[PDB]
């Protein structure tokens, strides 16, 4: 009751606050700060939070950014079997986000295209062509908006052509920030209660 409902309320404020700081850190390319804040939120999620759609949505976005942040490390794994690269995992998270945010396919398709493209290109950049082909086959063979790009990538892989413009013009920093603006555009962009209270208290 009014002892556990107090704990749940504060835990929600604390979570929502660090979520905001995590986004600010990511936005400023401060990924060391992001990873530290992520670890705080990780320890926080096991606490009672009640059942809000808002903390669930929060965590999915937080999951996507985490996988994108580690996206250039193909030796890193988010599943206990190391089957998937972080960007393959990010694709799975994005679909959960589309569902939970009740998004239209037209709204999601452009940014999903970005993640798929990045997943393959990183593999190519690391000369992991078998992996590139697999990801390409599993994520672009049956996707209407990716066909034009899918065609460029097959040829790049088969010719082992790292000097192709599609590869050379790719910027992972640019990719990350594009994904963030997409995710932030579907977020309640209001300042967290704790920050607002701190602004009053220090005023």
């Amino acid at each position: 009751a009014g002892e556990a409902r107090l704990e749940e309320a504060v835990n929600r404020w604390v979570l929502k606050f660090y979520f905001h700081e995590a986004l600010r850190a990511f936005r400023g390319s401060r990924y060391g700060d992001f990873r530290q804040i992520r670890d705080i939120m990780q320890a926080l999620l096991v606490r009672p939070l009640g059942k809000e759609h808002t903390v669930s949505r929060l965590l999915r976005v937080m999951q996507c950014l985490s996988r994108i942040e580690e996206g250039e490390n193909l030796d890193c794994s988010f599943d206990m079997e190391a089957e998937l690269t972080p960007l393959e995992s990010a694709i799975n998270v994005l679909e959960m986000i589309k569902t939970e945010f009740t998004l239209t396919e037209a709204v999601v398709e452009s940014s999903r295209k970005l993640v798929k493209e990045a997943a393959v290109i990183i593999c190519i950049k690391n000369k992991e062509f078998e992996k590139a082909s697999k990801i390409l086959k599993k994520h672009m063979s049956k996707d209407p908006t990716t066909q034009k790009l899918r065609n460029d990538l097959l040829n790049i892989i088969r010719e082992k052509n790292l000097a192709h413009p599609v590869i050379q013009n790719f910027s992972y920093e640019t990719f990350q920030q594009k994904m963030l603006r997409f995710l932030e555009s579907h977020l309640d962009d209001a300042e967290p209660y704790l920050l607002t209270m701190a602004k009053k208290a220090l005023k």
């Binding site: 990873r35 992520r38 670890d39 939120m41 990780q42 999620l45 965590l59 937080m62 999951q63 985490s66 996988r67 580690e70 890193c76 794994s77 988010f78 599943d79 206990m80 190391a82 998937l84 972080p86 995992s89 799975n92 998270v93 959960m96």
Partner: peptide, 15 residues
């Protein structure tokens, strides 16, 4: 499948 680490709301990486 991932399914079970996802439901767990795992933010940081397995390894």
């Amino acid at each position: 499948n991932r399914r079970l680490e996802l439901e767990a709301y795992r933010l940081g990486p397995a390894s």
